[PDB]
A paper describes a structure:
Here, we present several cryo-EM structures of the mitochondrial RNase Z complex (ELAC2/SDR5C1/TRMT10C) bound to different maturation states of mitochondrial tRNAHis, showing the molecular basis for tRNA-substrate selection and catalysis. The human long form of RNase Z, ELAC2, has two alternative start codons to produce a nuclear and a mitochondrially targeted form. TRMT10C is a purine N1-methyltransferase that acts at position 9 of mt-tRNAs using S-adenosylmethionine (SAM) as a co-substrate. SDR5C1 is a moonlighting homotetrameric short-chain dehydrogenase/reductase.
The TRMT10C/SDR5C1 platform in the RNase Z-HCCA complex is similar to the RNase Z-HS and RNase ZH548A-HS complexes, but here, ELAC2 pivots by ~6 degrees around the tRNA. Consequently, the active site is now ~13 Å away from the mt-tRNAHis 3′-end, and the active site channel is occupied by the 3′-CCA tail. The first C (C1CCA) of the 3′-CCA tail is recognized by H-bonding to S726 and S490 and to the backbone carbonyls 490 and 492, which lie at the entrance of the active site channel. The second C (C2CCA) inserts into a pocket in the NTD situated on the opposite side of the active site channel. C2CCA establishes H-bonds with Q92 and T127, which pulls C2CCA toward the bottom of the pocket. The C1CCA–C2CCA bond is the closest to the active site. Nevertheless, it is not well positioned for hydrolysis since it is 1.9 Å further away from the active site than the scissile bond in the mt-tRNAHis-Ser(AGY) complex. Furthermore, the phosphate oxygens point away from the active site Zn2+, so they cannot participate in the hydrolysis reaction catalyzed by ELAC2.
Residue numbers in the entry:
A (entry chain B), B (entry chain C), C (entry chain D), D (entry chain A): 7 to 261
E (entry chain F): 92 to 164, 175 to 385
The structure:
Amino acid sequence: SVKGLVAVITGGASGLGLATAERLVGQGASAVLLDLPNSGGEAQAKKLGNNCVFAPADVTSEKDVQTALALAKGKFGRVDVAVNCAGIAVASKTYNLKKGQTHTLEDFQRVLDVNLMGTFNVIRLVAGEMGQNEPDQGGQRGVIINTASVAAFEGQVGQAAYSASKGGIVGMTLPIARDLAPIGIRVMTIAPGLFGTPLLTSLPEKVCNFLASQVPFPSRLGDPAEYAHLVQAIIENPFLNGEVIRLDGAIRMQP
Amino acid sequence: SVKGLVAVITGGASGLGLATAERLVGQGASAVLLDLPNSGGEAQAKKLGNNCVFAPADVTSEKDVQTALALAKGKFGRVDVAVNCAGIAVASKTYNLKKGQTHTLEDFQRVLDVNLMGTFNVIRLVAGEMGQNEPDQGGQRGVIINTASVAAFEGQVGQAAYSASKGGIVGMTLPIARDLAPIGIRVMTIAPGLFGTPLLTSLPEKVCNFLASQVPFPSRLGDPAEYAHLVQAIIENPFLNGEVIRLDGAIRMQP
Amino acid sequence: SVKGLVAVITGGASGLGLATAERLVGQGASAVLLDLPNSGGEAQAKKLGNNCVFAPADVTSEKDVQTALALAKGKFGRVDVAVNCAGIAVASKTYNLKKGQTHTLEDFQRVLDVNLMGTFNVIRLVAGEMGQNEPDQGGQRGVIINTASVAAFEGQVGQAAYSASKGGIVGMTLPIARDLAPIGIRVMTIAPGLFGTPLLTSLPEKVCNFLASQVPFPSRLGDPAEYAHLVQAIIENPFLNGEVIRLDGAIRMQP
Amino acid sequence: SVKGLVAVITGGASGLGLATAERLVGQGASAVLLDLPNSGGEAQAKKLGNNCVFAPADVTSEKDVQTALALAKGKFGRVDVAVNCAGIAVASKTYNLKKGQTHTLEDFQRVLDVNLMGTFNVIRLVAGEMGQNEPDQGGQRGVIINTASVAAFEGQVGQAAYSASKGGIVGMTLPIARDLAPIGIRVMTIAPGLFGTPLLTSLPEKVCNFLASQVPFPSRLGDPAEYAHLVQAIIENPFLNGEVIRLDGAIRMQP
Amino acid sequence: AATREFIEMWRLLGREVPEHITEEELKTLMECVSNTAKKKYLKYLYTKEKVKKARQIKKEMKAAAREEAKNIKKNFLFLRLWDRNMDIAMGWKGAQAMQFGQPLVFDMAYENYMKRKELQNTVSQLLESEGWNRRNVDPFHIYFCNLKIDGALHRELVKRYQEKWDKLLLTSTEKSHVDLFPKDSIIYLTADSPNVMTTFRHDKVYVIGSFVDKSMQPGTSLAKAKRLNLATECLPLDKYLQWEIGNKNLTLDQMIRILLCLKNNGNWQEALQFVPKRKHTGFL
RNA sequence: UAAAUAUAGUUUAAAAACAUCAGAUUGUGAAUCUGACAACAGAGGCUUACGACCCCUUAUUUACCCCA
Ligand SMILES: *O[C@H]1[C@@H](O)[C@H](n2cnc3c(=O)[nH]c(N)nc32)O[C@@H]1COP(=O)(O)OP(=O)(O)OP(=O)(O)O
Ligand SMILES: C[S@@+](CC[C@H](N)C(=O)[O-])C[C@H]1O[C@@H](n2cnc3c(N)ncnc32)[C@H](O)[C@@H]1O
């Protein structure tokens, strides 16, 4: 069970992070919402009740994450689960010959920083926090769950930066799992497909509804609650390690 | 929830099948144990209580599976979940130059028949049974879960036949998921690593201890209960479709 | 170089096999065309000249392949390369709810037998033949190249049997590579996508033209000559082993 | 045929880049060696003859790459092939509980910048240069070949940063291939295993010799010449697109 | 030489001498400068050939028993290649250890103080030590320091390891440990150290003296560890064990096994389980 | 100072058992085969021989407290 577990959820003020927080807190876990200061995570933490707190942090910055992790230690005493849900995208083509536009390197950097470098920054710092835990009966100290995308495998046009960052998370899941295996920390990656996240619902109705219809079954956008369910399943199963689980409803992204 | 679901579990008299049956029946599902007549399946069905029955069938035989499926319809009225856990394994080298030994074609055939052709035989026949179900609120009629192995990805020396059969299940998961998507049947594949199945626990203590040590974390053989847990998670999660989940504790099989 | 190599090409009377034979014979290799008696391979062998012979064999039959391999040993004195190109497909849905139409088990068996069991039959028998070779300077005795498909990864609707067989070839590439590594035989798999073979011409003109257009670049059907080129590249490259190369022009099959 | 092609080879002053340059120049291509000013690439360019020039550039810097590409246009008139071979690594564990060591964020950044961000920087800029080419008979303007590693799939302990960067290249191969498919540029990725590169030789001699022995066949370190051969094969083959080819001699990395 | 004829008269007297002596061992008979020393050497060869005979007799007894057994006389997941696969697995761990593992130093600067007898025993002990390190879950990165290339100890190591010597996943160098590591992080282990080892430190390099002094020279390890200003530590044998008989200077194999389980987050009790039981009468 | 005491992988016994090393692609007794290593603290004596008997050195333990 996940009763009495402390989860540090990054990007927990919205989207898949908030869904994870809602479910975990409902199941009797304590959550730390690690999001940007302006993300309105304070309201979400207040909504979830006493067993949820807001830690304002940028995942790219070591100082911010350290302060946030310290807040978790102060409030709840330990960290058991880290869920990396913080993530941005840019939709830019590498090069379009007609109008002669080149993908700006700054946009590529910014996506890498948040998605890849931010995830790693959290991992390396939470591993320290989780290391301080006494092993349970199974010798487990913590679970780290990262969010890639299906873009990591089949990226659409204009998802080069996004695919690179998600490809990096998929790449480094196994090395990190092997790294932390002696300590007793499980590293797992979820690769969501098309979810009803704020980013997707912002898109034009024609585009969203078509993408939903292109999912084999169910022919709808991923409910964030389903992401939360898979997170809980991974936390509960003490033999899931070093694997990427595609939560996409069997969709492959067309060119 | 899995309360009130009817699962047809193939190879359910032992190993990962029995573990799945135990968990599902405990959670208030009905199970049909579909195994060979000579398996101790009747005792297992009697042990599990009223909500479990034994259907003697060879999975390679169409007649046998049809009779078994009919028994499920008779007893429980419907079929909601199919779990394919039936399997055999063979350790033969493709060619041994020193001893002048060639892999027997009959060995290759018989492994393919049970693992690959047996799984497909069940799938195509249960899809008919599941097709007759009224869609739920989400439009789902059934879930089909297949068991591959990590041999499908990293097969050791002497696992050519086994890897071929498990490779086939991994291959055809997505096509079948796309086939059954209109009907509203989810097809999922689990790829277990080293589990405390009867064939592993039979080994010398020194060999078992080595196999346990090979798994990064946890450094133990997979408890079949863990397999059962992942099965339940897949059944409960509406949005898991057309995917292989590696349940291996982050192990890659060395030559 | 492939000058003076003997290639046993399976299904060499047509399609990708014939293309491989044409190229290899042109580069100064000797080829054995291993195809069915009715395949018209005799005309192809006569056309290719003295350095090509026709061996009538069914790949599923051990006796047939043995006789064919013996013919190769008799004529050319050795076997250096085996290319498995023989294959059939059947386009049948797993289950059609509307029509109540179920995939025939016999159809599934027949596809498995030719594609998977036929490939393995050739491999295990040619490994014996290749084993008898004296190692070259690099310790290499032979190269075995198998043909899977992109169906192994992204199978279309109605390609369950085809995907299973191609999944099996992809699965067992690594185990067999590890098996034959002591002997010094390289095992490699090519996964073609949409080639202008007679099989694909057999589709409607509208459908083939659409499939060609769906290839990112180049937006045309795979030229069989390109398959032959990749075969030669694999033979020439000492360090390509235990890998699947997708030759598809960057196409992913949509559901 | 690669006669009269201009290849911009990144990291071409040593390792796999230099091997590629040697082969391509020998086959009648023109090469631009794009490496750091201190890399001693000038000597290599002088050695290779008139058809090879040295362009001092950092791949992370947009200005540097632009100047280097301009040098290529000045000297040779066009760019047909881009080979990305630039690479650094660090061997650092994510977290060492015993030693209380955390992986430095700066180390992670530096590896990502060179491997991932550097590769993308070259791609986006050379795509502009290649875009200016008139299509050949097949509609092809250019080929871009990237170097990942097998670390992208099976990363060892302490390879987290390297695996992340190589994972990113594998991730973004297909999106970029789909991006550039309209303008007829092929994007391909090679994933070398254990090669006789400066990266691998930096390990202890005893560790190198062990890693060599662990390759199934041939049981030796990859000759850089073999990478050059595969590069030429990709350039020659019109239908290789959006794929990662593992050139590893069938090795899978254990932790 | 006269020694060949010399041993003949000793054979007649029946002073526990073996049947035959190889020409190699004749050379070592000349080394002995005393009747008493010769006696101890002949007895060693006497017992050596006796055990060779007994083992052989027990061997062919088993062989004859095995062949008659043969006359009297399925679905597997795995081929039986366990010994092969274990060696590969231990290899992969050894390579990982060489990159990341904690150093542990054997100082080979003691050839001068050892005789031929003690020198073989050191190599025997080193062989066992590396074995326990190899087979461990968390191996030390083993350093052979102050190992001369052409030295007796190097020559003996090469003989026992054969072709495996080159392929061992440990670092052998003629250099000293002070040259390879920071001087502050070197803790020299010796029983003669006033400083007791309180807890195993993962940041420290431990130096173990490759020295089997049957002819006891006390303090030699300490003397080396003082000439170079190194920290010295001794095991808490007095604290945890009720010492009754025997030398407090343990063998190399025992030392490493004590350290290995100390490193692996064991307590001193679990560690001192490797201390010979004949030497103490329980934990206090 | 005096007493016992000293197994260099571990025990037991008055030589074995279990361990160690190298080789092995083992069809699941490899539960094996072929090799390597074999030194009851150390040195020197006596004797027909001995692990007894003498002596020295070092070490351990205990007793003593120093000629109480
Ligand atoms: O002869 C003995 C004795 O007189 C004396 N001694 C030391 N400890 C004790 C003890 O517990 N009880 C008695 N009765 N007598 C004791 O020491 C003499 C031996 O000394 P050595 O000359 O052998 O050695 P020394 O102390 O000179 O050695 P070092 O410390 O200078 O190295
Ligand atoms: C038998 S001792 C060598 C004895 C030598 N006379 C000396 O002064 O160390 C072999 C090695 O094991 C280690 N060792 C043995 N017993 C020890 C103990 N009790 N405490 C610390 N190290 C010990 C030391 O490193 C020593 O060099």
